[PDB]
RNA sequence: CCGUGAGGGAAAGCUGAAAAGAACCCCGGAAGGGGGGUGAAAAGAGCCUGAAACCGGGCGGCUACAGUGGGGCAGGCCCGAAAGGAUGCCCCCUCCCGAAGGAAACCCCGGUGACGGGGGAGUACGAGGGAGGGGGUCCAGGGUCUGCCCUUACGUCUAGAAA
RNA sequence: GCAACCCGCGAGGGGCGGGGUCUUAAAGGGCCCGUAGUCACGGCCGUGAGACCAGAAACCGGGCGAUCUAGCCCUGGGCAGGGUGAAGCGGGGCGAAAGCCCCGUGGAGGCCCGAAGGGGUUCUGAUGUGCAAAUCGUUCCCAUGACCUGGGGCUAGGGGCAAAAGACCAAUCAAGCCCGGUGAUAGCUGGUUCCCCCCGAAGCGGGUCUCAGCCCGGCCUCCCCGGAGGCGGCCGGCGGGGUAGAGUACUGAUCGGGGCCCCGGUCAAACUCCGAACCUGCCAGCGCCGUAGAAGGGGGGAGGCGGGGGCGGUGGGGUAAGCCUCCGCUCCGAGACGGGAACAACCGAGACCGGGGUUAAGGCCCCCAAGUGCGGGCUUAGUGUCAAUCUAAAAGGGCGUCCCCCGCCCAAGACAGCCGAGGCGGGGGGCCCCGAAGAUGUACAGGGACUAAGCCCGCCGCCGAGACCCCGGCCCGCGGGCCGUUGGCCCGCGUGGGGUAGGGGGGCGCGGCCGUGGGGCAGAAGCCGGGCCGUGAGGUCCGGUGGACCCGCGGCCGACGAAGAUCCCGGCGGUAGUAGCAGCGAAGAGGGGUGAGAAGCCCCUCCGCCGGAAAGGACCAGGGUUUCCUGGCAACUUCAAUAGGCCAGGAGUUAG
RNA sequence: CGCAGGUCGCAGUGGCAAGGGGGACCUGACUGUUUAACAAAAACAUAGGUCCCCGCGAGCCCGUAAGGGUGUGUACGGGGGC
RNA sequence: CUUAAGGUAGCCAAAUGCCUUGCCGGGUAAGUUCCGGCGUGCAUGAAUGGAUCAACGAGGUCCCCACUGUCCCGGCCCGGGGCCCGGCGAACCCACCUCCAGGUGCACAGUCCUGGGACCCCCGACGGGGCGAGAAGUCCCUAUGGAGCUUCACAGCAGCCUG
RNA sequence: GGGCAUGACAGAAAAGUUACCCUAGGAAUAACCGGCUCGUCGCGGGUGAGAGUCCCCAUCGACCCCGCGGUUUGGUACCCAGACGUCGUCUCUUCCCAUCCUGGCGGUGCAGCAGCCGCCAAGGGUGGGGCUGCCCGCCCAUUAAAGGGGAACGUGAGAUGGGUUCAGACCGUCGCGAGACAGGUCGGUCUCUACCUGUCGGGGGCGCUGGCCGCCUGAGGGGAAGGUGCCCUCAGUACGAGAGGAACGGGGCGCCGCGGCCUCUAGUGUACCGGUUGUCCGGCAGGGCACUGCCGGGCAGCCACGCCGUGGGGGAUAACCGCUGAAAGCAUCUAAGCGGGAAGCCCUCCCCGAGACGAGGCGGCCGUUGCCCUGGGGGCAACCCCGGGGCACGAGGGCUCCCGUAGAAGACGGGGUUGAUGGGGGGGCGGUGUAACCCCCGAGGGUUUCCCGAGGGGAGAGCCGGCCCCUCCCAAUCGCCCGAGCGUGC
């Protein structure tokens, strides 16, 4: 094998490293959360920028407990989501596949939805609810199709993003269906989904970096004593043994960046209602300003400075829950 | 033409009988193109004939879920004027003869049995060879494609070649 | 003589005898003798000649070269700047003096640093189908001298020249180049051109400066003579042998007992009293072959003289080997085809063509034709999945399980601790389990998978080759017959039909010649496609194109047949509208004009580069009209063009 | 060529131009020459040392020969080795 | 004894020491190299020159300081290739042309066997494979093949000496 | 007729050397790899003399024997001489297990701490230096440990070139000599524009049973996405004569790897601002060039030396440990049955994903039509059938246009006048560092003190922004296209 042992360069868990099929994240897994009341299990916001905040450590066992610590934070422009449709899911008896049985739409959708959907001039919402109601006894899941409102964001674009978010919180599918039916045509704010201080998961398409060499894409080492090597140094020496041939595990140049990624257990520091208290006087660089509600998350988030990020309840939460009290943000760097 | 030099040293034939060598008109910057002429024939000065490789277009067949070339059989589409048959070919029916080979039901004897034996029966049938009846139009042959069966480029040394 | 066959003569053939001659004292022996040659045409082979075609490195002869380079000679040119400070020479200080020190002046040197110039170290940089068949960048060495450099001169090939590396002597040097000897030779390597038919090998023995060759025999082929016997099989009569085994008696080893002998025991390729199977000699018979020709002999031509696989000799050697070296049958080579999962030689089996049928090996759950066939038993491990190549397995352990046998106890007082029926111990057999560990990808050995579709003992039917049987067609060998015949046709018989090298027989095609008969402007040759004939080489015809020659038949003659030689010449592809048109320290822009057409030509303005120079002035050799003017863009300039060192026309160089 | 004063910067030989230095061993004294096109060296040469053949009609060498070089020279010399 | 003599002055694990990373010191945290010693030194030694380093060195080697992207370890930027467009427009190589696994076979298969996969086409990049291309392998052997050099090979010829 | 001789004995008369080398060939024949073989080498097992205070087997294992691997060396000579680039290293991927650590278990001559031995187990790790060209080996400081092997002795159309192994040269030894030594030593050209395939990314199209839009599902594929340490408590406790000295459980944090991000810090930043040298533009100002002239700062962006995330669990199991339990009146973890049991396998988790041809589900939009020209056929009376072409209807899609959450080309994303998409203008924020003008001071000199003069001070900053906001002032226009519709059979 190798002359000296060492781990492989890069990961084979993100193979193939191709561009994402969609710029919107497509969440595969949604957790099962018991909150006592029906509620959406996720939210979508726009990544606006990064700051740092002084936060008092609220972990009693932590070695910085009671002290003020500077933490890098991410700001998400989070205007309310407009609930357009409600869809029901059953299980196919032939294979157990989750299959949609039907969906009821609001009768008059907004004009912005016509930019992305071929909709009828008016929906027969009552008839669609009657059609859905006969599938209630076999329903295993219910989700709401929601749309973003980019006019209320700092981007100011008009085309919305449409995605399904499941309704959870209680173990009764009928209560979930009733809550989803009640949500039709209304708007959900981030405070209605999450609470400050809780952990979430973030899913998003990371920043695109275009075609990149093997040194940056996989972290392969430049050839030592770089000037000694004819035909360059930003390369692997060999590209494989004689047998097998070129494998799929061999590092090669290609697309880097624009891939869907999931990051676990990011703590919601704040959920503000007016973005003026968080926007810098110069504004967020390359984004603009925040006027509506915003989410202040701890740490970093995948994606560029305008990407749509999906926050969900955690699927791999730690054993010890965070403190029930809201975290104390003493000062954000955007403030004076 | 090559080498300082002694020396070395190619490629390259063909209008038409007669220039009758293409008048004249339109276009083009021009090479030139269209029309129109000469000539038995463009044989057009890049000049007898004018092959293949090669490239362009038309036509026929295939063409994005199926691994390629060659052969045999069956078929789909296309050609099938002449030089081949059309007294053909194919279908059906009937009749006759028929090599080697050769059943079945059913009845009888035996075996646990798979099966054997007597009769049925050298029977029905059987390569092929003759005769006739009706029905139809092409048949042979060719191009391409598909299905099934078969199939390890050539020349060479070698004990041994797809190597 | 029914014939069978017997008898007589008996050319040719065979033998003896006789004769000529040599040797010898002679005998004996050697050669020769009772008839056929010669000339020619065609063919095959041998030797020489270039000798089927192509191929050396070399060697010799006569000539050419010192524009390169090596050395030296004659006559010119060149080397910024700085530093150090030799001999020599002055002053100052110090001594009683002999005498020391300090400073200056001076300008030596195969001296130092460093431009030009010369050289060529590092990056083992770039390049490496390059800018270039030796370059470029960078870093370096010398740079007043054994220094660098121009012109002229000398030294020439077995010779020169060499501060020496066998360097250099015109991109050529452990002996130049040119032409010639010369088609040098080559046991070696490559190539060697049409068809059908008959037969059909070898890699063995001996000799060889022989081991990649060759000759003599064995093996093949063709022709002839000869004349009736022959032998890969078998029985029998009469013989030979000394292996396997056996023995331990001769020659040797070797373990015990008993008293140098006796007894038991272990061995022998180089031991043998005995001794097979088996092989082999003669005779008789059988079997088969043979007068359509046995034995035997003569002549022509070879190939080949590298073998290989399976099985057997415990062959001999070796740890073993798909190892080395012998012996025998068979098969591959030179043999199709079925099975083996592929596979030259393992099994079956030997193929002219087409069809029908039946079988061989092997198989019959699917892939895949034929059986989820039949009876009994075993296996629980997916063990295993019907010989070998071919992918496996040992000592050892296991009542895991199925079974066979033997010894003992139990006489119901036997094994376990009164109970009541079997218990204990030993040996062996079958299958399976552990022993059992590898490298790209699944219980691998075909895959699916199977609890039988595995294994053992038996059984029944079926499928399945080109083999065997039948039919039709074709061809061959041999014999017979007919025809005026360098040949053609017919018939009969064949347990006739594979075939490389090679031998033998016939035919097709190409160019011409001797004859003979014809076609062609109402369309020859050639070219494109197509039909028909012929096993085939090939022939012939149709339609189109084309525009003057061509063909059938008999005979003869050749510069006579290509798919290949890293073949020769030419044309043309894919690669590919791809590489390159970067690198070496400059570059363009605006407006106008001309013009078919302008980023690029002409003019102005702006911007830039050199400026002891890849760049301004002069000029040698060499080049030779490239100079100037006018016009132009078919070709040339790594793109364009109206531009040009290009093309066309004209002109131009004045000396005491 | 020098002296005094003032003054700015991160940086005053400000760009350009422009030595890293020291110790020890082996080896060849040094400068010089060399395999044009893979070897620049410790290889060659070198001054210095030493030996040999030679008094000239010599020694050594070239030429077939005629003759030639060393030699327009002479042992403080010519030639030949290490 | 001895081929005559038997290595003197010196110098050494040396560019000369096999054993051998010799043994002892120094240097480093760690030293097969290096330096200073030791020497019955395979196989050191005197113009075959010994010892010997002042000066000189594009010589070979070890250490120290300074220095630093050599490296921990990689990042950003600049010019030219690059990529795209317009114009010009080749070459190498080429029997045909090839998805993967495990086998088999002139023993290392694109073409054979048994499997696993693949919708087809186009662009960029690389260099694992095509025992990739270039060059009738210089390494080894054979040939009754060469060339040059050597001498105590077999012969010969000049030259010199002698009668 | 006898002898004189060829012994290489079926009869030439015959020494070396070439690494300066040349030719013709040869896998008939070596060197490397490959093939066959395994003596050798590495590994496993049977046996038990003997040692182990006693005690064969905790730990060894004499004398012998049976095996396995292909990891060293050798044998052979089957392939390859018109050529498979020869050691080591770098770089990068994968596979094996005969396991060095990490997980599980057992034995012990296991009191604890430690150590030794065996079994399962290959998911992860196995590092940094000194010495030698090395491989190997020894050593240093750490560490959980610092395992070993295969892949054409993996990988030179990827590198390097220290070694070996050309031509030069020196030493020692050998040779009369030229020369030779797998003895030492110094020097000594690493060619190729990638045709096919593979791999990694990026595009066009057809198909999915009429076309399309949006949202989903999940067959299957990839994954290491995680691995591993330390400290405190336990506890100076258990254990122990003492010395010494644990563990389960709880709390805290690293290191290695992986995936993101740019708030901070660091780097860069030939956008930008300033200082300054030499020269040219007549001087000031401003500027050219010194290949950003050099120096200092530095927004955005990118980036790491910075920051963030990076888990437990379930199931069947291995080695085995147990329950019940007969065969076999007892006993027995096993035969039937049942319980427990690993960093390993599957799922959970992350990424790709309907070309998943059984080409999927849901909701919606659309088409499911007409007209014109021309050809042929049927019956001619209308008419009808079929071939070709054009036009309209039509959901949806693209090109052109302004851009950037994107980007080699393609693609993707946003906007496109019911518009804030790029520019302009205004404002915000920010970089540099305080322009011009004006006034004050200025070492000293002179036209004495209204002049020169490097320079300091005050007010003023000045310049600039590949960032944010507002504002229709300019330009997102004009235009060019694709597009289902019909029959058939089962
Ligand atoms: Mg290099
Ligand atoms: Mg012509
Ligand atoms: Mg016809
Ligand atoms: Mg006819
Ligand atoms: Mg051969
Ligand atoms: Mg061979
Ligand atoms: Mg042969
Ligand atoms: Mg062949
Ligand atoms: Mg001859
Ligand atoms: Mg000769
Ligand atoms: Mg001569
Ligand atoms: Mg000259
Ligand atoms: Mg000098
Ligand atoms: Mg070099
Ligand atoms: Mg280089
Ligand atoms: Mg190159
Ligand atoms: Mg100098
Ligand atoms: Mg030499
Ligand atoms: Mg010569
Ligand atoms: Mg010649
Ligand atoms: Mg025969
Ligand atoms: Mg041969
Ligand atoms: Mg007998
Ligand atoms: Mg015997
Ligand atoms: Mg015996
Ligand atoms: Mg015998
Ligand atoms: Mg032989
Ligand atoms: Mg044999
Ligand atoms: Mg077979
Ligand atoms: Mg069947
Ligand atoms: Mg055995
Ligand atoms: Mg098995
Ligand atoms: Mg035959
Ligand atoms: Mg004739
Ligand atoms: Mg041929
Ligand atoms: Mg040619
Ligand atoms: Mg071409
Ligand atoms: Mg181009
Ligand atoms: Mg290019
Ligand atoms: Mg300049
Ligand atoms: Mg200038
Ligand atoms: Mg000049
Ligand atoms: Mg001119
Ligand atoms: Mg002119
Ligand atoms: Mg001219
Ligand atoms: Mg400089
Ligand atoms: Mg020197
Ligand atoms: Mg020098
Ligand atoms: Mg050289
Ligand atoms: Mg050199
Ligand atoms: Mg010397
Ligand atoms: Mg001296
Ligand atoms: Mg001497
Ligand atoms: Mg001594
Ligand atoms: Mg040394
Ligand atoms: Mg010594
Ligand atoms: Mg000596
Ligand atoms: Mg000496
Ligand atoms: Mg000596
Ligand atoms: Mg000396
Ligand atoms: Mg010395
Ligand atoms: Mg094999
Ligand atoms: Mg191939
Ligand atoms: Mg050769
Ligand atoms: Mg050669
Ligand atoms: Mg040699
Ligand atoms: Mg010979
Ligand atoms: Mg010669
Ligand atoms: Mg002999
Ligand atoms: Mg061989
Ligand atoms: Mg070998
Ligand atoms: Mg190899
Ligand atoms: Mg062993
Ligand atoms: Mg034991
Ligand atoms: Mg081996
Ligand atoms: Mg081979
Ligand atoms: Mg080869
Ligand atoms: Mg290769
Ligand atoms: Mg090669
Ligand atoms: Mg194991
Ligand atoms: Mg290798
Ligand atoms: Mg290479
Ligand atoms: Mg390679
Ligand atoms: Mg080297
Ligand atoms: Mg050498
Ligand atoms: Mg000597
Ligand atoms: Mg060397
Ligand atoms: Mg390349
Ligand atoms: Mg390419
Ligand atoms: Mg990272
Ligand atoms: Mg800067
Ligand atoms: Mg100024
Ligand atoms: Mg200027
Ligand atoms: Mg500049």
UniProtKB/Swiss-Prot annotation:
Residues 227-236 have a biased composition (Basic residues). GO terms for biological process: translation. It comes from the Archaea. Keywords: Ribonucleoprotein, Ribosomal protein, RNA-binding, rRNA-binding. Pfam families: Ribosomal_L3. InterPro entries: L3_arc_euk (IPR045077), Ribosomal_L3_dom_3_arc_sf (IPR044892), Ribosomal_uL3 (IPR000597), Ribosomal_uL3_arc (IPR019928), Ribosomal_uL3_CS (IPR019926), Transl_B-barrel_sf (IPR009000). GO terms for molecular function: rRNA binding; structural constituent of ribosome. Signal peptide: none annotated. GO terms for cellular component: cytosolic large ribosomal subunit. One of the primary rRNA binding proteins, it binds directly near the 3'-end of the 23S rRNA, where it nucleates assembly of the 50S subunit. Belongs to the universal ribosomal protein uL3 family. Part of the 50S ribosomal subunit. Forms a cluster with proteins L14 and L24e. This is Large ribosomal subunit protein uL3. The gene is rpl3.
């Amino acid at each position: 094998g190798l002359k000296i042992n060492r781990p492989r360069r890069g990961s084979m868990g993100v193979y193939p490293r191709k561009r994402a099929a969609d710029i919107v994240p497509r969440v595969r897994t949604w957790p099962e959360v018991n909150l006592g009341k029906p509620t959406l299990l996720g939210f979508a916001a726009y990544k606006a920028g990064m700051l740092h905040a002084v936060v008092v450590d609220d972990r009693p066992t932590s070695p910085l407990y009671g002290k003020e610590v500077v933490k890098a934070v991410t700001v998400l422009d989070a205007p309310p989501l407009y609930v357009a449709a409600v869809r029901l899911y059953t299980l196919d008896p032939t294979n157990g596949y989750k299959v949609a049985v039907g969906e009821a739409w609001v009768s008059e959708p907004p004009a912005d939805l016509r930019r992305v959907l071929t909709l009828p001039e008016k929906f027969d919402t009552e008839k669609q609810l009657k059609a859905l109601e006969e599938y209630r006894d076999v329903a295993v899941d219910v989700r709401v199709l929601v749309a973003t409102q980019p006019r209320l964001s700092g981007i100011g674009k008009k085309t919305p993003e449409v995605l399904e978010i499941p309704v959870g919180g209680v173990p009764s599918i009928d209560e979930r269906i009733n809550f989803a039916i009640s949500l039709l045509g209304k708007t959900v704010s981030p405070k209605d989904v999450f609470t400050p201080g809780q952990l979430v998961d973030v899913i998003a398409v990371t920043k695109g970096k275009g075609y990149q060499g093997v040194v940056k894409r996989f972290g392969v080492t430049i050839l030592p004593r770089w000037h000694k090597h004819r035909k360059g140094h930003r390369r692997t020496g060999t590209i494989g043994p004689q047998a097998p041939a070129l494998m799929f595990t061999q590092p090669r140049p290609g697309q880097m960046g624009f891939h869907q990624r999931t990051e676990y257990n990011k703590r919601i520091l704040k959920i503000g209602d007016n973005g003026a208290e968080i926007t810098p006087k110069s504004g967020f660089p390359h984004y603009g300003v925040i006027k509506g509600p915003y989410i202040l998350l701890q740490g970093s988030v995948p994606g560029a400075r305008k990407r749509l990020v999906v926050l969900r309840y955690p699927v791999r939460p730690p054993k010890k829950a965070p403190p029930a009290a809201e975290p104390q943000v003493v000062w954000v760097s955007s403030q004076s």
